Amino acid sequence: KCSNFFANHWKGLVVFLVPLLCLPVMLLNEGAEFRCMYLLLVMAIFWVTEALPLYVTSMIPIVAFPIMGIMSSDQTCRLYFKDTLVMFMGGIMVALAVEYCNLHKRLALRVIQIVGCSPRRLHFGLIMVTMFLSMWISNAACTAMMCPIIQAVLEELQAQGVCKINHEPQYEPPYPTKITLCYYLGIAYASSLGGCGTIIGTATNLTFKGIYEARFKNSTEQMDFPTFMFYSVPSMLVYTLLTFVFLQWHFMGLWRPKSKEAQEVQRGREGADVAKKVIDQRYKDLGPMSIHEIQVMILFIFMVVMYFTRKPGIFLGWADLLNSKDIRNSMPTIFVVVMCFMLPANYAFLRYCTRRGGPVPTGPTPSLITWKFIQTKVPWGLVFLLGGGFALAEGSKQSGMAKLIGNALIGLKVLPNSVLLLVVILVAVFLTAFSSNVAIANIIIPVLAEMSLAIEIHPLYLILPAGLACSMAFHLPVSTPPNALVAGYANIRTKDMAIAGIGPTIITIITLFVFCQTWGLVVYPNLNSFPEWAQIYAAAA
Amino acid sequence: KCSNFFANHWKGLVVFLVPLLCLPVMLLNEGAEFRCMYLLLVMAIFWVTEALPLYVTSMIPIVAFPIMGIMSSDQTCRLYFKDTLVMFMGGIMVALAVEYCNLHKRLALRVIQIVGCSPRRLHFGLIMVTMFLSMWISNAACTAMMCPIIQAVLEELQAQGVCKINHEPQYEPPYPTKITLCYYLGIAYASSLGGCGTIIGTATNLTFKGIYEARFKNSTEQMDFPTFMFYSVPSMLVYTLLTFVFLQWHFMGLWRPKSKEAQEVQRGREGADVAKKVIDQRYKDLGPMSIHEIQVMILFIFMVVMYFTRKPGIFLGWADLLNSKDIRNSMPTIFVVVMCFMLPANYAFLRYCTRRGGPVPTGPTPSLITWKFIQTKVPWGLVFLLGGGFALAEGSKQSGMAKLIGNALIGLKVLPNSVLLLVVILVAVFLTAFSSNVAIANIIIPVLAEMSLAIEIHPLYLILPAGLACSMAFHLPVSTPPNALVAGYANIRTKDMAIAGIGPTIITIITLFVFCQTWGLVVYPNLNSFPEWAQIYAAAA
């Protein structure tokens, strides 16, 4: 029974020991940079193990930094709540606003009518629409939005009888069937993948954009919003299609002509007509567009286009027009939220003022969304988690440990650049797979910045592939909040998820390694050589 | 039927008209100070009218200020997490932690045992314990904690047959009768009143302390933690006691024995012994004190002690001990939160494996508090409200509103100082009566500071009484959240509460006007004479 104590109490022992075990690192060496390293290491161990609730560990810098003497208490508390975080919160709130009026259901059904009711065509349509959705909102919001539609469509096919929701016929909740697992893992993976396309979709893009633009004010290259799309989208398409093919083969016998599941998908092909009838009758059941949905759509489109035109390459941009003070992208999303609270819902009140119509509303007209709804659904804990990364970045920069570790990693000079790039990709993936993506990106990026400063490489040549690499996380439930939500709301098991995750990782390293060296040259032909403006920085350091 | 239109849809009209109607303010006068004036006025009129939800309107500065050119967008978002805010949020969290383990029940029952069980003594005991609890934590959490205890007690008395909580069946929610009205209003008023006690009682104290420290740094006086308590406590005891007496007279038949309420109280006196049996039997039912409660109590006391002495003082100032960089009071509360997450609940597991006596737990022991609980209880909206208040204060200082309005009120020098102080108190209370406290403090403090600079009057002499008075709100449900919670919990017709408000307002005004002039001179010696360091700023302006 001495083993059972280890079985049911392992989470506590790690908390008790790890600070004590790692205590000597401060004591032996002198500089407070070692104290910063101690804090970073212990916080990382808590993150990866999930001994404490994941959010609460991010609070530690508040007590740590003033005691360690690294940074003043007032500034450290200030660093959490920055404009990017406001953008992210506004995005989540407007996504809930979309969810309120059921518009996503209509969009899904319309796409289904477009594609048809064949099983593989169904899967392809869902993957593509999920990618398109997640290109421009929060990933956790995207998957939470889309999942109930998924449950509805497979329970409709349950009424059809082609598939089974749970692998066992209810024999802990029962294991889901291969088909259901395929659908849920597909939506999760596509949701995660979509972030790489656009700056706005996932916070990691914003974080390393901020880090790079902070370190080098004098960079000739710009990392512009249209150019970021031009770099990102082709690879995005290639590996999302490859992930589709791999997932289809792994679960449904796509390229295996003979399988028991192949008979199942052929049977699903047989009942195409009845599925078409249930789908188009179901669409008919929704009814014509209400106004409510119409202005929701208008606000969403306005928000996206208003992001697009903030000093773009082709256009002058409104930011230059309103050059009174520097305005970030936080303004449009909050503008949308406030208006979404202002505007009415049905406009029936207009009947009394001028119209001859009969009906008149009895009470106050409800607005688009109600604060009672917003409080319950949004995951408020994310603010601390996002703030922790900024706190760590600022602390590491001011304490100077980044310079120490960068000058420590100086032996890599002998290697040719391409193999160094491969090593960078591999280490970035390995680090990401064990925590939240934003935190890992904030840890990793500055030391590579200083490394490139030292080992005479153009910095962006490593920074951009690294930042793109930080996004993927495919085989840990704790790795990425969309994966956590998909673990919820369903009965997926960790081992099967991990073994399914082997494909997309291999695919994404291969495709980044291939397209970076080729496409970036077209995007930037100066990455290979070392520019003079960076030589000035090197001389400065 | 057009009467029904204005009766039902006025909230939309105010939103549509007021921003448009108040437009000429910026058009007629060129200075950006008037733009800031317009912003402040429209925000305030939205606040008082409650057309929009209270929280959402405070978002407006982060969109208005970057466009209007007063201050950059980055700074505005930075203001929303000044350390006082995280201190307040942590205070709410630890209050929930106390709530989780039923400590308040034990405290209330013990105090009831100490005082007695006669009706008037019962009411007095509840009032005193409510005040003592609200001494240290946020007011909304305090009243939300204390509310169901009163429900239980009145249910007990209903079982005894002394009185009925409901007024009458069918004379829409039922009307409450006198006794329950008295009890609930006592709870609300006592909570709000005792919140005035110390620095940590309510966000207004933190707000105006921070403003005073920011505007003036060379001043002799400091308003550290002990001195504020010394200035405040003697007054709060007096007006709390007088409030108790007034509530006894108005609702409970104190001095009028030839009244119907006198006979019911007399009937209550005979049955006091049976109620004593019920009370102490119920206390016996609750059982002995567990380790859980002991731990949470130790953490609470440790937190308050760290506040008391760590900051500069005669004995054992730990801030002096760790003075590499200045550390504020944010550390202890977040320390308590994270520590409260770390510790276990039972200790049976660890001790039992070594001890070998007693059952082995079959699962991991839960921590003191669970993030699921924190998710659904904290009023997360308060962050935006406090941020809006801070933003308004900073913007008014930056743009030049304060200097203009202070110079505009230059004429008030003719009146004697006591009369001026009385006018300040009266106007402060009247403005507090409309909207939330922290907003009024933010609007009022800076203009008073600049005016007192102009009139050559020691600024503390006015700023402290006004800051104390801003807490006092006793009339309308929108004025302060505890009133809303009470009115919602048991339906209260606002007419009765408004009528009952006439007592505490008069009592508080009189006792403040007397006790300031008496006690402040003792605690602060030089208030009457204008100090030289203020004259330096006077020449600076």
Ligand SMILES: CCCCCCCCCCCCCCCCCCCC(=O)O[C@H](COC(=O)CCCCCCCCCCCCCC)COP(=O)(O)OCCN
């Ligand atoms: C100068 C730099 C400063 C940096 C500061 C950074 C912030 C703070 C960092 C940490 C500081 C030390 C904190 C120590 C906390 C110990 C918690 C022990 C919890 C515990 O007993 O867990 C059990 C195993 O540990 C054990 O068996 C533990 C053995 C010892 C138990 C007795 C502990 C007594 C209390 C010690 C704290 C001081 C007094 C507080 C009143 C397993 O239990 P489980 O599996 O059920 O866990 C379920 C999850 N909770």
Ligand SMILES: CCCCCCCCCCCCCCCCCCCC(=O)O[C@H](COC(=O)CCCCCCCCCCCCCC)COP(=O)(O)OCCN
């Ligand atoms: C060159 C000058 C530049 C100046 C710049 C500075 C000033 C800028 C000011 C911007 C103000 C924007 C205001 C937008 C909202 C207007 C108010 C609408 C209120 C409303 O719906 O009222 C209804 C009653 O009818 C009414 O109140 C009757 C009027 C209805 C008007 C409808 C307007 C529709 C606008 C277009 C909407 C669709 C497109 C959106 C992009 C419902 O009132 P209620 O009380 O029942 O409900 C209240 C919510 N629960």
